[PDB]
């Protein structure tokens, strides 16, 4: 029942090979709906979901204008951060920013976030009150001082608590077929001998949406966390997700092992058995 809107931005410098690469994507929950790529021909914010295509020319012009402004700010950032960290131009560096809002079952605001990373590590983030900052090291303290003096948090909070939530509701209504669905996992387990004395048991979940899911193995009711290989939830490419978890067990012991599947689409969590 709960929902989120998030925007993800990546800028990468490329020493002596021109301007930095800038990519922006927007999601509602686990469904992407817009992109911008600085290297592409169009130089436009572009639709990536059917239900956003109906937005009119003012939306696309304004979103293109705003995303280019974001691009330019991150361009400047890569130079500023090299100065903050006393880094040279021999190497490529990466800035990432992500922000957005969560709402619960009733579509009321839960929480907002606005986070920045440099070279894969936290740099600065708005705290949960949306009134103050968490700066991860001394260079980020410089940014904190500047963003406090410029009252950045107040502008962000107004967006995250208000504007962000309003667009999320709009998207949820316009894309209701896609966005307000839940596809329960189709589940099964597979068994394959790896030798005359051991077998791999793999628990599958297919064709589910949203992506959040939990798959766990038990042996006589005891969790087998340290012995489980759990892969990252992966897209099928049709708007649904897949995931598996495996254990390697002594042949003959299969009936001790059970797979447990939890997903919001299931009316009850499933236990799959070998008997």
């Amino acid at each position: 029942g709960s929902h989120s809107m998030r925007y993800f931005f990546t800028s990468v410098s490329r020493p002596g090979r021109g301007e930095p690469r800038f990519i922006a994507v927007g999601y509602v929950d686990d469904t992407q709906f817009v992109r911008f790529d600085s290297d592409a021909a169009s130089q436009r914010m572009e639709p990536r979901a059917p239900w956003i295509e109906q937005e009119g020319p003012e939306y696309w012009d304004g979103e293109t204008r705003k995303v280019k402004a974001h691009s330019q700010t991150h361009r400047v950032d890569l130079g500023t951060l090299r100065g903050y960290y006393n880094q040279s131009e021999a190497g490529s560096h990466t800035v990432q920013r992500m922000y957005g809002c969560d709402v619960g079952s009733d579509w009321r605001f839960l929480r907002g976030y606005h986070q920045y990373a440099y070279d894969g590590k936290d740099y600065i983030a708005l705290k949960e009150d949306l009134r103050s900052w968490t700066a991860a090291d001394m260079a980020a303290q410089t940014t904190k001082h500047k963003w406090e003096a410029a009252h950045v948090a107040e502008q962000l909070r107004a967006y995250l608590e208000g504007t962000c939530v309003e667009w999320l509701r709009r998207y949820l209504e316009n894309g209701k077929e896609t966005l307000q669905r839940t596809d329960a996992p189709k589940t099964h387990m597979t068994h394959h001998a790896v030798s005359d004395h051991e077998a791999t048991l793999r628990c599958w979940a297919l064709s589910f949406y949203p992506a959040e899911i939990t798959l766990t193995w038990q042996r006589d009711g005891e969790d087998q966390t340290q012995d489980t290989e759990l892969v990252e939830t992966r897209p099928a490419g049709d708007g649904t997700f897949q995931k598996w978890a495996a254990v390697v067990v002594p042949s003959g012991q299969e009936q001790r092992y059970t797979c447990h599947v939890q997903h919001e689409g299931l009316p009850k969590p499933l236990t799959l058995r070998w008997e």
Binding site: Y7, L81, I124, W147, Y159, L160
Partner: peptide, 9 residues
């Protein structure tokens, strides 16, 4: 839709 208020670090 995107935010505004995005300042340089």
């Amino acid at each position: 839709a995107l935010g505004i208020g995005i300042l340089t670090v």
